[PDB]
């Protein structure tokens, strides 16, 4: 099973920058979503969920085939809430219908990260829409009620090591949980990409509680929350060391997240030797827009 990247016919960096810009301008404009968090976090979650179906063992799933557009994956219980991201990107696809679904979903996550003042994330084009029978079955995305050993084992399937896992989880600085989506009670939320997830873990006074959906989560007096899987990053001594490293080095966290997030988004894709180099998109700010 090989998924070869194929550049959308006649497209180059500037075509993709125009798509990035449309997404970025829309992120700026539609600012009321989710109590004024905006769509940035759900777009990052969308990019992760369409990528996180990958299985290194047989090369099924992953971002390549754009399969989230099909009902089986769209309706995965693990994807509840992501419809909001799909709806946001719909008009962008309508404006730029030449771009593949996988390229659009992944670029939405890159654009969101960068527009939320996160690291630059190099991004490659050439995901190709594959047919409905290529859609992975539900059940490949991770459970939140689990411990550090679950986390570690889970991410082996995505070929992620401890550092990559801890860096990727730093995206939980963004946005929040919603009881109605995931059975987790949301806490304090932000829409700026920083290393604060790690700072929160280390500095807050956490108490384990059971929420109204009967799920356990860690809650701080300050109004913050952590999933059991988030909290597992300070219970495991290998993960804890990395948490401390990122809490104490913003630049290191940015550079590690960038690498890990690009890898996540590219898992399963074979890039021909003469494929274009990765694109680094300018933010709206850098363009004076
Ligand atoms: C053990 C792995 C993970 C688990 C169990 C997990 C679980 C969750 C859960 C339960 C939610 C709340 C969904 C809702 O109620 O709306 C959430 C939201 C989110 N997740 Fe994760 N996640 C994991 C890894 C990641 C990774 C690797 C990324 C990105 C790199 C990510 C980015 C986000 C974002 C940005 C949101 C917020 C969505 C919003 O505000 O609407 N997650 N995740």
From TrEMBL:
GO terms for cellular component: mitochondrial intermembrane space; mitochondrial matrix. It catalyses: 2 Fe(II)-[cytochrome c] + H2O2 + 2 H(+) = 2 Fe(III)-[cytochrome c] + 2 H2O. GO terms for molecular function: cytochrome-c peroxidase activity; heme binding; metal ion binding. One of its GO terms (biological process) is response to reactive oxygen species. The keyword Mitochondrion applies. Residues 99-289 form the Plant heme peroxidase family profile domain. Keywords: Heme, Iron, Membrane, Metal-binding, Mitochondrion, Oxidoreductase, Peroxidase, Transit peptide, Transmembrane, Transmembrane helix. Heme b binds at residues 45, 48, 172, 176, 178, 181-182. It is found in: Mitochondrion intermembrane space; Mitochondrion matrix. The keyword Transcription does not apply. Destroys radicals which are normally produced within the cells and which are toxic to biological systems. Forms a one-to-one complex with cytochrome c. Belongs to the peroxidase family. Cytochrome c peroxidase subfamily. This is Peroxidase. The chain holds residues 72 to 362 of 362 of the full protein.
């Amino acid at each position: 099973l090989v998924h070869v990247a194929s550049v959308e016919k006649g497209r180059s960096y500037e075509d993709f920058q125009k798509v990035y810009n449309a997404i970025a301008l829309k992120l700026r404009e539609d600012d009321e979503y989710d109590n004024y968090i905006g769509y940035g976090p759900v777009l990052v979650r969308l990019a992760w969920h369409i990528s996180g179906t990958w299985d290194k063992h047989d090369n099924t799933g992953g971002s390549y085939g754009g399969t989230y557009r099909f009902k089986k994956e769209f309706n995965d219980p693990s994807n509840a809430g992501l419809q909001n991201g799909f709806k946001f990107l719909e008009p962008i696809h309508k404006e730029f219908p030449w771009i593949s679904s996988g390229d659009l979903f992944s670029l939405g996550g890159v654009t969101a990260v960068q527009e939320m003042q996160g690291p630059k994330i190099p991004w490659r084009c050439g995901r190709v829409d594959t047919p409905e029978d290529t859609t992975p079955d539900n059940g490949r995305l991770p459970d939140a009620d689990k411990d550090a050993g679950y986390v570690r084992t889970f991410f082996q399937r995505l070929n992620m090591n401890d550092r990559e896992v801890v860096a990727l989880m730093g995206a939980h600085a963004l946005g929040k949980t919603h009881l109605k989506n995931s059975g987790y009670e949301g806490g304090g939320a932000n829409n700026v990409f920083t290393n604060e997830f790690y700072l929160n873990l280390l500095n807050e006074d956490w108490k384990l509680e059971k929420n109204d959906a009967n799920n356990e989560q860690w809650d701080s007096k300050s109004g913050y929350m952590m999933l059991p899987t988030d909290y597992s990053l300070i219970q495991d001594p290998k993960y804890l060391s990395i948490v401390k490293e990122y809490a104490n080095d913003q630049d290191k966290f940015f550079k590690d997240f960038s690498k890990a997030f690009e890898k996540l988004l590219e898992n399963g894709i074979t890039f021909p030797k003469d494929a274009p180099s990765p694109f680094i998109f300018k933010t709206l700010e850098e363009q004076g827009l």
